[PDB]
RNA sequence: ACCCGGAUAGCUCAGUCGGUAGAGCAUCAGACAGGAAACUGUCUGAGGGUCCAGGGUUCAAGUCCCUGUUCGGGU
């Protein structure tokens, strides 16, 4: 799902702006579970299109949606970036950079 | 009650395992404040034997003592390790090489 | 800008009188029933947290006080 250097880049990003916790392998491997269960292609995963599909296929649901689905659409976020090359350093900023393109 | 060397290392050791809180005077203070009102001398805090007679003379009333009695017997107890001079990082330790013994 | 409420396990959430934290799902391992078997079910165990950040009170803070960050809601 995850390139071997994009992982150290992963493992890198802080959850929390001023956090001291920061993201692991445990989140992609949730992240794709609950991908099925809301009938999505966990496929789409492993590329920087494929993110940009489910990104916004599920912005809408936000405004409506559940604390768990807001920590979802987050890591994809994040993930998105790490395919795009984009340097973050917390969630945050990962959905800063993700607006900014609009 | 504690000597010059023996605060340094006091004050290094922390209260839980992994704390950021460690141990100051207030601690002592206030351990020995506790000991007056259960008609114990205070003065046997600065010996490694003092110490240990109180931590003995604590043991059984553990089971059905208050939270603050517990209190009191861990701060006791790692008063002692550094009377002795026994290498300990927080009270955890303290606890367990008392009953490594 | 102001008021209110959140932040605790990978996720959603509980946490009583202050006294070092639990469940559900998820992940891993195992057991039992039916079945040659692939499998279809039922239960059990384990790992996984320092409780957003920084200070203060206290012998002792997830818990009480203040600040900052952040999310939602309201005017
Ligand atoms: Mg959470």
């Given at each position: 799902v995850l390139s071997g250097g994009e992982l150290d880049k992963?493992?890198?990003?802080?959850?929390?702006?001023?956090?001291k916790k920061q993201y692991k392998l445990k989140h992609i491997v949730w992240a794709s579970r609950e991908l099925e269960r809301f009938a999505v292609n966990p496929g789409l995963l492993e590329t920087s299109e494929?993110?940009?599909?489910?990104?916004?296929?599920?912005?809408?649901?936000?405004q409506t949606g559940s604390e768990?689905?807001?920590?979802?659409?987050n890591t994809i976020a994040v993930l998105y970036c790490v395919?795009?090359?984009?340097?973050v350093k917390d969630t945050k900023e990962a959905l800063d950079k993700i607006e900014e393109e609009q």
């Amino acid at each position: 799902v995850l390139s071997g250097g994009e992982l150290d880049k992963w493992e890198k990003i802080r959850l929390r702006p001023g956090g001291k916790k920061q993201y692991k392998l445990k989140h992609i491997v949730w992240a794709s579970r609950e991908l099925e269960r809301f009938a999505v292609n966990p496929g789409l995963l492993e590329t920087s299109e494929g993110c940009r599909q489910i990104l916004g296929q599920l912005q809408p649901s936000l405004q409506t949606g559940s604390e768990e689905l807001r920590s979802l659409y987050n890591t994809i976020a994040v993930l998105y970036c790490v395919h795009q090359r984009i340097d973050v350093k917390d969630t945050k900023e990962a959905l800063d950079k993700i607006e900014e393109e609009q």
